[PDB]
Design a protein around this ligand. Structure first.
Ligand SMILES: Nc1ncnc2c1ncn2[C@@H]1O[C@H](COP(=O)(O)OP(=O)(O)O)[C@@H](O)[C@H]1O
Lengths: 68, 63, 124, 57, 120, 57
């Protein structure tokens, strides 16, 4: 009905967050210190280290545009 | 091409707040055209406007 | 459809409804419009027939016979449809009195009077 | 039939509120400019920079 | 997220605390599974200090990570124009069409289409 | 019979919406004016003009 293959849904939850920082660096090359900081707030709120009353992650993209 | 830019930058009303992120990030560029007398009282008096607008002098024909 | 009227057009349709009260009528038939315009001295409908070469006496007799055979009429809704087409033909925006006159030559039950009086559709 | 009668009898806001200057030049309705060769070539160089990329006449 | 007043700024603050907003019809949509990302434009130490003075005091500190995108490194620009042209090659592999680009055309598509303060 | 009714329902709009001032002056029911000999006679010398024939007090 949608289009995403089945192989992208049968992956384990504990294995997708480990290789998440390596998949985003395939197309976006240049921000090696910004992509790593993205998984720092997602992997912390899913392991019980963050209060459940707060959402997933809160980001604020600043600086010049055109980077990605 | 913005004819007489001193009106849109703070006369109609002040519309320079919505055009600052566009001119800085390069999303929407514009070409200014005003008088040297009005260019000092609206561009040189603001540090944020001088760093983005470059002084372009127009030569006057003679004979 | 946007069928706007002018100041002069409203003075004719409103007077045609009250004109049928004296002639003993209970409906607004489109044939009563041409009768009111012919009863006014120096009107717009009379000046048009003089330039196109038409006898105003024979035309008045044609619309008078239709009124006798009569007992808002549904025929009035069809007359306003053909009159709106003449508004866009003359490169105009409003609907004056001459626009309602040109619609009389489009109806099959109203174009017979114009033929016997000497009114050509191409010349009108 | 009544729908097309009431109506008759991207680039939408740019053609109604603004005037496209390239349309008059591509149709021969714009007057040419001869003598400003030292200014047109400078405006192009300003737009291809980082600091002060907005020319002001 | 900078071209607004203080009406929408105070409404988004309760989402980062309670986790749900008050709907006008009478619902409590839990925002526990909805990530909140923003985009603005207010070396990297002096950039984040500007956005802290524009918004409220009790809002810029509750942000998880203040990721500030720096300038584009010239050594990484060449690696960007190479992975984008691969998508065009994928659409021509079914028709047996080999799209080859020399080393001269790759330099023009990098120093012109990319700029630190101009945008892609 | 249907024609004489609409006629009934001189002048009609002048006797149902306006008060004739000359009617009260002819029957002696209007107070005279003593002292305005230079103002009342001035209005007569204005209505007999070609331009600006509408005096405003
Ligand atoms: N690594 C990249 N390769 C190719 N194109 C890119 C890359 N990074 C960014 N872009 C392009 O730059 C553009 C940036 O758009 P952006 O300014 O984010 O739009 P908006 O201001 O509406 O969010 C995107 O449309 C994207 O196509």
């Amino acid at each position: 009905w949608t289009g995403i293959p089945v192989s992208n849904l049968q992956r384990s939850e504990k294995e997708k967050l480990l290789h998440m920082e390596e998949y985003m660096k395939q197309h976006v090359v240049g921000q090696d210190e910004a992509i790593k900081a993205i998984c720092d707030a997602i992997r912390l709120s899913r392991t019980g280290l963050q209060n459940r009353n707060r959402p997933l992650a809160s980001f604020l993209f600043l600086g010049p545009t055109g980077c990605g | 091409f913005i004819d007489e830019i001193h009106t849109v930058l703070g006369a109609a009303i002040d519309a320079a707040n919505l055009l600052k992120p566009m001119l800085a990030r390069g999303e929407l560029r514009c070409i200014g055209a005003t008088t040297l007398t009005e260019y000092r009282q609206y561009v040189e008096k603001d540090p944020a406007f001088e760093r983005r607008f470059q002084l372009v002098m127009v030569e006057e024909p003679s004979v | 459809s946007s069928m706007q009227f002018t100041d002069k057009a409203t003075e004719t349709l409103n007077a045609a409804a009250k004109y049928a009260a004296e002639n003993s009528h209970v409906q607004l038939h489109p044939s009563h419009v041409a009768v009111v315009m012919l009863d006014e001295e120096n009107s717009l409908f009379r000046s048009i027939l003089e330039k196109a070469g038409g006898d105003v006496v024979s035309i008045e007799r044609g619309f008078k016979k239709i009124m006798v055979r009569q007992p808002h009429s549904p025929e009035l809704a069809k007359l306003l449809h053909y009159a709106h087409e003449h508004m866009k033909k003359q490169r105009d925006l409003y609907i004056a009195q001459d626009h309602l006159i040109l619609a009389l030559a489009d109806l099959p039950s109203m174009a017979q009077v114009l033929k016997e009086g000497g009114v050509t559709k191409k010349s009108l | 039939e009544n729908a097309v009668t009431h109506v008759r009898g991207a680039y939408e806001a740019l053609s109604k509120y603004c005037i496209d200057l390239t349309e008059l030049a591509a149709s021969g309705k714009l007057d040419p400019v001869i003598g400003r060769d030292e200014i047109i070539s400078r405006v192009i160089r300003v737009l291809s920079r980082r600091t002060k990329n907005n020319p002001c006449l | 997220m900078e071209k607004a007043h203080k009406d929408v700024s105070n409404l988004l603050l309760q989402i980062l605390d309670d986790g749900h907003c008050t709907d006008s019809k009478g619902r409590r949509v839990d925002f526990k599974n909805t990530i909140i990302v923003m985009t603005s434009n207010l070396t990297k130490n002096a950039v984040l200090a500007t956005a802290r003075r524009h918004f409220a005091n009790e809002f810029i500190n509750r942000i998880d990570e203040l990721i500030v995108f720096n300038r584009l490194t010239p050594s990484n620009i060449r690696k960007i124009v190479d992975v984008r042209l691969k998508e065009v090659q994928e659409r021509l592999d079914e028709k047996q069409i080999t799209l080859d680009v020399d080393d001269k055309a790759k330099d023009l598509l990098a120093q012109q289409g990319f700029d630190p303060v101009y945008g892609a």
